[PDB]
Amino acid sequence: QARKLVEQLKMEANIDRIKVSKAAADLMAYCEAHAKEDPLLTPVPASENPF
Amino acid sequence: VQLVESGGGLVQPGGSRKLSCSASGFAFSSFGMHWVRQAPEKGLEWVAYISSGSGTIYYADTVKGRFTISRDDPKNTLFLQMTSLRSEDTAMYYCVRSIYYYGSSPFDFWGQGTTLTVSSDIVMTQATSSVPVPGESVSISCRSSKSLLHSNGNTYLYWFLQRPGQSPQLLIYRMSNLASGVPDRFSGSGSGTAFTLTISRLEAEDVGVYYCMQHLEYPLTFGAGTKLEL
Amino acid sequence: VSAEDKAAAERSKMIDKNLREDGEKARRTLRLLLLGADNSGKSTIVKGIFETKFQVDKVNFHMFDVGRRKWIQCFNDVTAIIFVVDSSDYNRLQEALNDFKSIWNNRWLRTISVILFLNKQDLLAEKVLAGKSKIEDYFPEFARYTTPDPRVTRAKYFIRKEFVDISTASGDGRHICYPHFTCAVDTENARRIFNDCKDIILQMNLREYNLV
Amino acid sequence: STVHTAYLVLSSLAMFTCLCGMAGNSMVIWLLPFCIYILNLAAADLLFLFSMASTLSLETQPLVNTTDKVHELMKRLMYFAYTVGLSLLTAISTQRCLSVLFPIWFKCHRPRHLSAWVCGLLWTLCLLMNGLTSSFCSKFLKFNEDRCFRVDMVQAALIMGVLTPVMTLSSLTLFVWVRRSSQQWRRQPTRLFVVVLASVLVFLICSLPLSIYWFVLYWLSLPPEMQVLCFSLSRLSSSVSSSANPVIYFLV
Amino acid sequence: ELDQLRQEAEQLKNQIRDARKACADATLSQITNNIDPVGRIQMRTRRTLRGHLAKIYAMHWGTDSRLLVSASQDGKLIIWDSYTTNKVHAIPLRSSWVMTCAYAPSGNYVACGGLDNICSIYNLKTREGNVRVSRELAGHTGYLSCCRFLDDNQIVTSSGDTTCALWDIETGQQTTTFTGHTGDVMSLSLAPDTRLFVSGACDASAKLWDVREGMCRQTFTGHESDINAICFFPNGNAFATGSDDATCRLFDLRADQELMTYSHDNIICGITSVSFSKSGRLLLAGYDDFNCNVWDALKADRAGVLAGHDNRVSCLGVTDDGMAVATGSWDSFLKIWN
Ligand SMILES: CC(C)(C(=O)N1CCC(Nc2nc3c(c(=O)[nH]2)CCCC3)CC1)c1ccc(Cl)cc1
């Protein structure tokens, strides 16, 4: 019962964690390396819009 | 899936007959049905068209006025009533199912036709009337009067295999897509007014007459037919 | 449009026609929802999802129950909710009353009427007349309450007053509650829902017009 | 002089109310069961009030043959709009009465397009009858005493013996069946009561007078001053009715 | 005995909280400060897809960014051609209490489910020219709230029995069961690699599962009310959760705590559906206030509003190619925004 909780918490305790700076930098890097291929972020011309 | 046609026989010129197609094994009411005839030693020719729900009817110019196509949905039966029969109407009339939604495969199943013996338009060209050729690769070409490439990115070219003594069978729909059951060796490619159908590792039970059909606009027109002989 | 596209449009129009046909056939019936914790006689009022048909005066009725804090959102278009209470078991009557307060004040039922049935009012008589049990043991406000057999009647109006008092607190008039005393042998239960449904549908009709 | 004294003040008030009602009906149409009838009635009222402004402007000048032709055309379009507006008012009254009398039928077994069917029937039948009246009543058409009298009598009998009675009786029935049903509600709805009373009162006080005049003219003829003053009052009264319709039927 | 275990659990929780607190050196709001703001986006409706006669509870795009499937309370799935508004298929359902709606990546199958506790797979590309059930997936004790296709033979379902499950459609049996949630699992997003998946429940906790090993790798808890929507960032290392708290939060898998909160002083309504863009810069969020909001995922500012629905926006979807957004409300209409 509670042994399941303690086992799960022990499994969750020993996990490698990176700093928030690195994760945020990676997230921003993905948002920046794919911005030119985002049809909603940048408006699409009437020719390239199926709608 | 089974389309079994009926009628047929020796008919005096000027007489009237009704051909009956009996469907079985599929949702017949949701399928648009065509009539295609094939003269004793000629190619495939389109005749009529009943739409799902019987809303739309299209006839060929040769049979315009003296032919009537109608369906009985509760009885799963397709009909062709035709009067004033002429000596140009001697052919094995094939019944064809076709369903039209996005990404569908029209002209996919053909029935075993019944032979009837009576005692502008886009033109399809298939020049190689007979290519002699097992285990090798062949290319079959087709041309068009106008570019079969529509504004919506669809190029409406079809390919059919008529095995000897058999109803024709769909191979490619819209010049790129393989049907449900055809081997992957087949493949079609081309552009507007330029088409080809290449085969690799040609086998047995694989030689016949290859017809290219247009479906850009009515009337639907076939090629003369490229034949492959072993 | 090409021949393929025209035929696809025709197919879509046929789908559309069938969709309105199904919509009309669905609109001809009234949807309900049967609630109640347990041991309440839910299944005997009209004698994962259990749906029951019944028709009164040529009106199709279609109840549903389950076998709630999140899926109530599905039943926001129902005509009415049927809430069932066992009024003969005062040990857990306050649980039922809190449950009614929860359903009544739920965000997605702010315009949905609730039809109360206080089942086993045939056993409430036995419990009150026997003298073994006592309301004042559980609800203190009983001994200082008088009705506006006599004392069984005063008791059952006391319970109804509790439920209708939760109902009045924050109804705001957008939806109301219909109490009904019922038994297990009582048959006139589809008729009560029928009349209450006429009342609710009258309110809805007068509300599509910005009047009531 | 004295007869002509009020003929400017009433005309100015009528024109102002016509402009206000035209603006209101146009706004109501721009914004838009109930909606179909309200849109049709708003279109009728807009036509009627535009014709009102047109006939005021045209009467403000000496009459010419082509000018009189335009006057007759605007007059007949006015009366056609008046008839269709009365018909539609009747339609909403009956619709409300039905939604109270048969709530379950109204919600379940009522055709999804009955408003369009009824609006088409009202527009078509009114157009036919009013075209018959115009053809046999215009000074520049197949004008004829007997035909004009017969068509006017049939139209007037239709309105003041079919169209206003059903409006009045249906609103009264809604009043009765809601009063007897709200005897056990914790709202005692007064908004409905004031709305219904307002609809009936506006009808019988500010829409029907134009018909009442064009009927009483035929029989027991009046002195010219009474005719002029009664017409001046009645046109303005119809203006107030077609200005109050959008309020009662959209804002409440 | 139980006291010792509970004390160990409290020590473990304190250790977790201290572990996360050491990694939070600099907030994303500080790092994201010096980038170009997206400004205002004005995405107008391009299509309206009418034909539903009840509330739309779910929808899902296809892989080709051309077809989509929508489920409503009229007991019907409709497969739409978004380019032309045509209805490609109408699938009647045995139970009309549908809450989820899934389109297979191959496109041969669709799945729907709800209060009947059965996931149903429909065979679209068949002979006989109709759509028919291929398999009814039973075994959940509660209602199905989401279901996503791993492939033609595998599907993952979240449910109101606090459990997510993974199935073999060919055998129709629960291959693995994911347990550990305490509330009703409301949303379920599948990772781009289809090896992990993140689930949000009614206990304000988001959980990360390994599809193969069937284990809760990480648990994220910052929300104050039930989580209604969850979606991976396209990178696959983060995800966004929407809750009834009127708040969207971005969680990182590697940092293992919340990164950003998307809240405004005006919003008080619960969040119904969350989607990302292709680049991950916009965070489409459907709200109970009958319109959607476009949050800048990095800067946390409303970049736009999608206001075309006169009832609550229940679903939300963005195409794989990124051209169009779809919204479906309880107003029986679904609109395609660009
Ligand atoms: C519905 C309404 C208002 C109507 O639309 N009318 C009246 C005005 C017109 N009638 C009309 N009669 C005549 C002339 C004319 O120039 N016109 C000139 C010659 C005398 C007769 C057209 C028809 C109505 C009809 C009948 C009655 Cl009794 C009362 C009202």
Order of helices and strands of chain B: EEEEEEEEEEEEEEEEEEEEE
Quickly give the CATH architecture of the largest domain in chain B.
Sandwich
The end-to-end span of chain C amounts to 49 Å
Summed up, the domain count of chain B is 2
In percent terms, what proportion of residues of chain B is strand?
over 45%
CATH class of the largest domain in chain B: Mainly Beta
Oligomer: heteropentamer
Q: Largest beta sheet of chain C: what is the strand line-up?
A: 2-3-1-4-5-6
Number of strands of chain C: 6
List how many beta strands of chain B DSSP finds: 21
Q: What's the SSE pattern of chain C?
A: HEEEEHEHHHEH
Bound molecules: ligand A1BE2
- Classify the helix fraction of chain C into a percent range: 40-55%
Continuous helix count of chain B? 0
Instruction: Name the pair of protein chains with the most residues at their interface, and give those residue counts.
Output: A-E, 38 and 61 residues
What does this structure look like?
- Chain B has strands at residues 2-5, 10-11, 17-24, 32-38, 44-50, 57-59, 67-72, 77-82, 91-98, 109-110, 114-118, 124-125, 130-132, 138-144, 157-162, 169-173, 177-178, 187-191, 194-199, 209-214, 226-229.
- In chain B, strands 2, 4, 5, 6, 9, 10 and 11 form a seven-stranded mixed sheet that branches.
- With 230 residues, chain B is mostly beta strands.
- Chain B folds into two domains: 5-116, Immunoglobulin-like, CATH 2.60.40.10; 124-227, Immunoglobulins (Immunoglobulin-like, Sandwich).
- Chain C is α/β, with parallel strands linked by helices.
- Chain C has a single domain, classed as 3-Layer(aba) Sandwich (Rossmann fold).
- Chain C has helices at residues 3-27, 93-104, 121-130, 135-138, 150-169, 190-208; strands at 29-35, 49-56, 59-66, 80-86, 113-119, 177-181.
- Chain C has a six-stranded mixed sheet with strand order 2-3-1-4-5-6, sandwiched between helices.
- Chain E has two helices and 28 strands.
- In chain E, a hairpin with an 8-residue loop joins strand 8 and strand 9.
- The longest helix of chain E is centred in the N-terminal third of the chain and has 22 residues, at 2-23.
- The chains are: A mainly alpha (51), B mainly beta (230), C alpha/beta (212), D mainly alpha (252), E mainly beta (338).
- Chains in contact: A-E, B-C, B-E, C-D, C-E.
- At the B-E interface, loops of B face loops of E.
- The complex binds the ligand CC(C)(C(=O)N1CCC(Nc2nc3c(c(=O)[nH]2)CCCC3)CC1)c1ccc(Cl)cc1.
- Residues 79, 83, 133, 137, 148, 152, 155-156, 159, 210-211, 214-215 of chain D line the site of the ligand CC(C)(C(=O)N1CCC(Nc2nc3c(c(=O)[nH]2)CCCC3)CC1)c1ccc(Cl)cc1.
- Chain D: This is Mas-related G-protein coupled receptor member D.
Key words describing this protein structure:
heteropentamer, C: alpha/beta, Rossmann fold, six-stranded mixed beta sheet, 6 helices, 42% helix, E: 338 residues, mainly beta, Methylamine Dehydrogenase, Chain H, four-stranded antiparallel beta sheet, 2 helices, 8% helix, 46% strand, binds ligand A1BE2, transducer (chain D)
